[PDB]
């Protein structure tokens, strides 16, 4: 690139205008993007905005790891374990059994054990197009209760089949994250308590540190009135 | 640098699933010195990533952004730390204000006296902690210190 743009926020208004393009000229914007992208990169599904993005595990009806039947497609009536979701598109990438496309790929992105440039790759698919399985497929799932998961380490909801709430579709237990990194502090030290609220006389963090912690010349923090000030103000 | 590498590969980087930023509650029960150390470690990490990120963007023209994401995450932890530092000071100030109101302080002292002091079924240890907590008396001189001494004398007389 030879840019330097990344070390600053210059031409901010222009960037905002470009970034927040009007939605009725979104086809115009993306037409040229589509053209630019090669076949193996580009996706058919609409790149949804971060507002309309499934952040919660309730908003996603399915998690990476669970088993799902595909429908409304070429590879329909096919069971597939969903591998990973795409965040920008609001869609899932399925395993080998799911929907795919055969596309030419350059030798930069060649897998070990390839004869041809042609490679089959999995297309993204929406949560609307595929239904759960348990063999019995599920029409729709609803969430009514919640609980702390041991493996996920989150207060996740209970996936219950729509109609009869007692038939729980359980979450897929994820793979064990064997953490061995120098930049992650271990559980014992991460949580060990070294502070206690003890003193009322001595303040906990020093007076010379305050200017870093908060702006002492803050225009927002208005001063309170006094009697003398009132008297001065009023005729 | 990190392990004397010109650039951390994808394998050399810490994976996203294994890594989490600090929680504000977790930070809240850490000492000042510890928090300061953590902050400086974060800053160091950012510098390492910033060097690398710059190289990636300026020279190779990538859009891989793992380093950038890491830097952002670190920045998040840093501001959370900054927030908890401010919050602790504010809490202290509020406590001071509360104590300054005389009746409330008197009530608090009475409550302290009733339950744990002057009771049976340790006391010295409580007093030493209480001394530090409420007055300027460790094991230098002020009106507050004097008041604490007087209170201690009163307690001794009672007991």
């Amino acid at each position: 690139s030879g840019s330097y743009q990344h070390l600053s926020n210059v031409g901010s208004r222009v960037m905002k205008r470009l970034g927040n393009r009007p939605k009725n000229f979104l086809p115009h914007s993306e037409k040229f993007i589509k053209k630019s992208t090669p076949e193996f990169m580009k996706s058919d599904l609409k790149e949804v905005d971060e507002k309309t993005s499934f952040k919660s595990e309730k908003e996603w009806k399915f998690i990476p790891g669970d088993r799902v039947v595909v429908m409304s497609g070429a590879s329909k009536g096919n069971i597939a374990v969903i591998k990973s979701f795409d965040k920008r598109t609001n869609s899932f990438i399925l395993d080998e059994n799911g929907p795919t496309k055969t596309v030419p790929v350059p030798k930069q992105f060649w897998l070990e054990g390839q004869t041809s440039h042609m490679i089959t790759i999995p297309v993204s698919i929406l949560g609307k197009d595929l239904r759960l399985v348990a063999t019995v497929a599920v029409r729709d799932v609803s969430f009514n209760g919640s609980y702390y998961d041991a493996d996920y380490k989150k207060v996740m909801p209970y996936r219950c089949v729509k109609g009869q709430p007692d038939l729980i579709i359980p979450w897929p237990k994820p793979d064990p994250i064997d953490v061995q990194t120098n930049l992650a502090t271990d559980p014992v030290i991460a949580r060990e308590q070294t502070f206690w609220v003890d003193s009322v006389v001595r303040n906990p963090i020093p007076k010379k540190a305050i200017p870093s912690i908060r702006n002492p010349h803050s225009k927002y923090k208005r001063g309170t009135l006094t009697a003398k000030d009132i008297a001065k103000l009023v005729a | 640098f990190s392990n004397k590498k010109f650039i951390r590969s994808a394998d050399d980087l810490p994976p996203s699933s294994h890594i989490r930023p600090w929680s504000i509650p977790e930070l809240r029960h850490k000492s000042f010195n510890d928090l300061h150390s953590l902050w400086y470690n974060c800053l160091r990490e950012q510098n390492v990533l910033a060097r690398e990120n710059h190289l990636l963007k300026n020279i190779v023209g990538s859009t891989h952004d793992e380093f950038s994401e890491l830097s952002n995450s670190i920045r998040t932890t840093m501001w959370q730390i900054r927030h908890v530092l401010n919050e602790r000071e504010l809490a202290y100030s509020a406590s001071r204000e509360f104590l300054q109101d005389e009746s409330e302080r008197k009530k608090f002292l009475d409550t302290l006296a009733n339950d744990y002091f002057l009771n049976k079924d340790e006391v010295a240890s409580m007093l030493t902690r209480f001394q530090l907590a409420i007055f300027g008396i460790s094991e230098t001189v002020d009106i507050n210190f004097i008041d604490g001494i007087k209170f201690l004398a009163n307690l001794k007389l009672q007991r």
């Binding site: 795409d86 897998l111 993204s124 | 994808a10």
Partner: peptide, 15 residues
């Protein structure tokens, strides 16, 4: 999406 898939494939190959 493709890039992420490719990365995953590489990882699988490695392990």
């Amino acid at each position: 999406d493709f890039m992420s898939w490719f990365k995953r494939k590489k990882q699988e190959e490695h392990q």
